[PDB]
Design an enzyme around this catalytic site. Structure first.
Site, PDB file in Angstrom:
ATOM      1  N   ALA A  11      25.997  18.965 -35.860  1.00 13.19           N
ATOM      2  CA  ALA A  11      26.655  19.094 -34.579  1.00 13.19           C
ATOM      3  C   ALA A  11      28.053  18.395 -34.779  1.00 13.19           C
ATOM      4  CB  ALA A  11      26.087  18.194 -33.600  1.00 13.19           C
ATOM      5  N   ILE A  15      36.622  13.644 -31.652  1.00 13.25           N
ATOM      6  CA  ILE A  15      37.211  12.538 -32.173  1.00 13.25           C
ATOM      7  C   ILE A  15      37.830  11.540 -31.128  1.00 13.25           C
ATOM      8  CG2 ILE A  15      37.518  13.731 -34.330  1.00 13.25           C
ATOM      9  CD1 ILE A  15      40.486  13.854 -33.814  1.00 13.25           C
ATOM     10  N   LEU A  18      35.976   8.393 -24.304  1.00  7.14           N
ATOM     11  CA  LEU A  18      36.139   7.283 -23.601  1.00  7.14           C
ATOM     12  C   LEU A  18      35.248   6.120 -23.780  1.00  7.14           C
ATOM     13  CD1 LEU A  18      37.852   6.434 -20.847  1.00  7.14           C
ATOM     14  CD2 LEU A  18      36.063   7.111 -19.533  1.00  7.14           C
ATOM     15  N   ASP A  44      31.581   7.072 -24.468  1.00  5.57           N
ATOM     16  CA  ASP A  44      30.608   6.011 -25.022  1.00  5.57           C
ATOM     17  C   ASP A  44      29.993   5.181 -24.289  1.00  5.57           C
ATOM     18  OD1 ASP A  44      30.048   4.790 -28.052  1.00  5.57           O
ATOM     19  OD2 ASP A  44      30.828   3.011 -26.533  1.00  5.57           O
ATOM     20  N   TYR A  49      26.014  -2.566 -21.275  1.00  3.98           N
ATOM     21  CA  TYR A  49      27.202  -2.638 -20.254  1.00  3.98           C
ATOM     22  C   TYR A  49      26.857  -2.803 -18.888  1.00  3.98           C
ATOM     23  CZ  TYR A  49      29.389  -0.914 -24.750  1.00  3.98           C
ATOM     24  OH  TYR A  49      29.725  -1.099 -26.316  1.00  3.98           O
ATOM     25  N   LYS A  78      23.244   3.387 -26.694  1.00  2.00           N
ATOM     26  CA  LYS A  78      23.218   2.096 -27.783  1.00  2.00           C
ATOM     27  C   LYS A  78      21.912   1.537 -27.500  1.00  2.00           C
ATOM     28  CE  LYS A  78      28.093   1.803 -28.503  1.00  2.00           C
ATOM     29  NZ  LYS A  78      28.582   1.654 -27.051  1.00  2.00           N
ATOM     30  N   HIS A 111      22.609  -0.632 -31.517  1.00  2.00           N
ATOM     31  CA  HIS A 111      23.951  -1.253 -31.276  1.00  2.00           C
ATOM     32  C   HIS A 111      24.287  -2.494 -32.189  1.00  2.00           C
ATOM     33  CE1 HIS A 111      25.941  -2.407 -27.367  1.00  2.00           C
ATOM     34  NE2 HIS A 111      26.818  -2.482 -28.347  1.00  2.00           N
TER      35      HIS A 111
END
Ligand SMILES: NC(=O)c1ccc[n+]([C@@H]2O[C@H](COP(=O)([O-])OP(=O)(O)OC[C@H]3O[C@@H](n4cnc5c(N)ncnc54)[C@H](OP(=O)(O)O)[C@@H]3O)[C@@H](O)[C@H]2O)c1
Ligand SMILES: O=C(O)COc1cc(F)ccc1C(=O)NCC1CC1
Length: 316
Positions: A11, A15, A18, A44, A49, A78, A111
């Protein structure tokens, strides 16, 4: 500069993505909507979070609006440290999927290499303040990640904050089924990571650079800490190229064949940070930026330095 890099699962990964750590829940939906509107195709995320529901609202609304198709997005999350046991991995992934309102992730990362005692607390403590480890080893957590690929929950699996010996442990895992696709690590001109990057790239593992701006909003920032965005030497390179310092800091990892994930909730900066496909740093610029290394870490996981799998005692 092509916009995507080929992973070892076949895949392609954008590059530029956010970042969403510290993005407040009342601001991150609009941040992600703006990001998608101005060209971002990679977000990301992480369960720890505490904002994946709100990130997901944005993704879903842009899919519904047909601003993008799902196949054009590259969504990363993660597995948190309190979910390293094999019987918890699937449910942790499923909670992330349900919050992001997706039926698969493009990439799911371990993570940190350190497993913690499962429970409600993200950092379970003993009465003396140490973080309570899990006994589940890295390799068994990796096998559980491999099962997510085979169940269709995730397209790719990888790791984050793994040192080279920890990467090597998985690569050497008896019966390894899927290699890590990515190692996501801190990387910027003050922590240039040559040794670990070379090792990962030599094994076909793509490196993602986190905290590329030096995480000025990290909660433990001190006034005397070095500041990439305010470094006059970096500002000078930016001025020479008629770009902002942030744009130079984002373009730098791109030219090392890294993926990079700057975070912002500010619409103007989200758009600014994406306008990095219109200039080139010279080799001399690159070497000069590399010369600023001071082995300085935003993210040192200081509460876990006695964990058997703490990653940052090794040189790299
Ligand atoms: N795997 C891991 O363990 C790990 C650890 C750390 C980070 N990450 C990931 O990497 C992402 C990025 O790292 P980070 O959040 O630590 O920090 P960062 O991206 O280095 O810096 C974010 C900070 O820079 C500011 N900023 C953004 N664009 C700017 C610009 N053009 N001009 C000036 N200031 C600007 C942001 O402000 P505003 O938001 O107020 O605009 C925010 O305060 C995270 O969000 C997360 O997704 C992963
Ligand atoms: O984990 C991350 O990616 C970034 O944050 C950390 C970085 C450290 F060096 C140490 C601790 C954290 C942390 O408390 N993480 C969980 C919730 C804050 C997200």
């Amino acid at each position: 500069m092509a916009s995507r890099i080929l992973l070892n699962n076949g895949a392609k990964m954008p590059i530029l993505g956010l970042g969403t750590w510290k993005s407040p829940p009342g601001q991150v939906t609009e941040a992600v909507k703006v990001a998608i509107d101005v060209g971002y195709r990679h977000i990301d995320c992480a369960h720890v979070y505490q904002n994946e529901n709100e990130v997901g609202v944005a993704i879903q609304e842009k899919l519904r609006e047909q601003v993008v198709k799902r196949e054009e997005l590259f969504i990363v999350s993660k597995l948190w440290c309190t979910y390293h046991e094999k019987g918890l991995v699937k449910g942790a992934c499923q909670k992330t999927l349900s919050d992001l309102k997706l039926d698969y992730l493009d990439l799911y990362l371990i993570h940190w290499p350190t497993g913690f005692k499962p429970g409600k607390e993200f950092f379970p403590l003993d009465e003396s303040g140490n973080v309570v480890p899990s006994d589940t080893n890295i390799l068994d957590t990796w096998a559980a990640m491999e099962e997510l690929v085979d169940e269709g929950l995730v397209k790719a699996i990888g790791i984050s904050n793994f040192n080279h010996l920890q990467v090597e442990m998985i690569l050497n895992k008896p019966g390894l089924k899927y290699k890590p696709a990515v190692n996501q690590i801190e990387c910027h001109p003050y922590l240039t990571q040559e040794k670990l990057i070379q090792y990962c790239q030599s094994k076909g593992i793509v490196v993602t650079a986190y905290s590329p701006l030096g995480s000025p909003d990290r909660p433990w920032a001190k006034p005397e800490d070095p500041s990439l965005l305010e470094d006059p030497r970096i500002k000078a390179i930016a001025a020479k190229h008629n770009k902002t310092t942030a744009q130079v800091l984002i373009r730098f990892p791109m030219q090392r064949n890294l993926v990079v994930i700057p975070k912002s909730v500010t619409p103007e900066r989200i758009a600014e940070n994406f306008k990095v496909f219109d200039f080139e740093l010279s080799s001399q610029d690159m070497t000069t930026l590399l010369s600023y290394n001071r082995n300085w870490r935003v993210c040192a996981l200081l509460s876990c330095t006695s964990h058997k799998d703490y990653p940052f005692h090794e040189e790299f």
